[PDB]
Assembly symmetry: C2
Homo-oligomer: 222 residues x 2
Amino acid sequence: ELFTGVVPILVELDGDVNGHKFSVSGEGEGDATYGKLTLKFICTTGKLPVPWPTLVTTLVQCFSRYPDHMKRHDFFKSAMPEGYVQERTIFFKDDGNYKTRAEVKFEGDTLVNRIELKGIDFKEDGNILGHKLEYNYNSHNVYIMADKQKNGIKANFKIRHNIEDGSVQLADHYQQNTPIGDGPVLLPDNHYLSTQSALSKDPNEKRDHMVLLEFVTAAGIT
Amino acid sequence: ELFTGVVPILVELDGDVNGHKFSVSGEGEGDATYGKLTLKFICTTGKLPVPWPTLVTTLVQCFSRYPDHMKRHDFFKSAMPEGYVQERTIFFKDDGNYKTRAEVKFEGDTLVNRIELKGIDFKEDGNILGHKLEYNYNSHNVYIMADKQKNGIKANFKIRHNIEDGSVQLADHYQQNTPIGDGPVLLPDNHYLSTQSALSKDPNEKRDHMVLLEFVTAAGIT
């Protein structure tokens, strides 16, 4: 019942990639009923040192639409409102890696996502620091599975980023979510979230920014 | 000035794939200012004989956002309102092909897209008739170039459809657009439309349907 209508979302990221520091703020709405997300981000420190698309997975899986027969497998929502801690190690192929940690939870009537990111070992002439990624996005499945010992879930997936020259840059994600609260939570059977994203720009917008539209739906359980 | 605000869109498709006939109706809005499209489709003849994703390219490139320095390369809009005729031969790899022909133009204050599609040579146990495609979509670039002789453009691109088992099904598109009117039109320099799409469902919707969200932006000219 928290995700019954449109829930406002607020995002805050502080990162550091090869010594370069940056901040990103975002605002939006989520509608777990359609599993739709509309967010907008702004680099508040000037210009983003890495391509915007590399931050999409980092910058709220609680807005996924879970079919009715799949409701007992919804860890994300069942953890609200104390929220949960999401962590990932993202490995960019033949390049470096981002290590992230975030707390997603309700602060009042707003779903907030506070993140801290650290990226090391990035090649200067690579697709990432070299900004060779096209500004668009592909479709993926986020495999999810419970971590009973930690009372949470583990998830994993491979994102494919389109480089300008036509090739693709794989970014391997390894995820871990644990509750912030102390009570029972819903531990799921193995399943996945079919995720789709679309990036664009607000033409009346001067700051470095990205507008993001995503759709997520759980699938995998019959 | 026709595409100045939100323009209503109306789509009508009559097809035939390996002897199976079907109709699709769609309704939406376009906003060439953001290069955003929101459409909804319904199979009016019952259940769609092919996967919904294979009809996305067929089911209005006039809503692309063309940056200000790229305005003289916009064939699509410059042909309004008499409109233009779009034709394609789409080759699905190791499978059959769709041959399409449509007239896109204004009827009153509504942009209408009337299409007729014929698909032949489809393998029964293939990804297409076998419905092995995931219900999602990827990002592509539509290369565009003028056809001065025909006073229109030719375009071409390769769509990658995600099959369920993890592989991909290529669909080669070959396109041709010619004006319906008789006056000068804008013939572009070589360039492309960065296109992004996201598919989903209206949960309160019983008919076979697809909700489509796309973003298109021209790029390629400096």
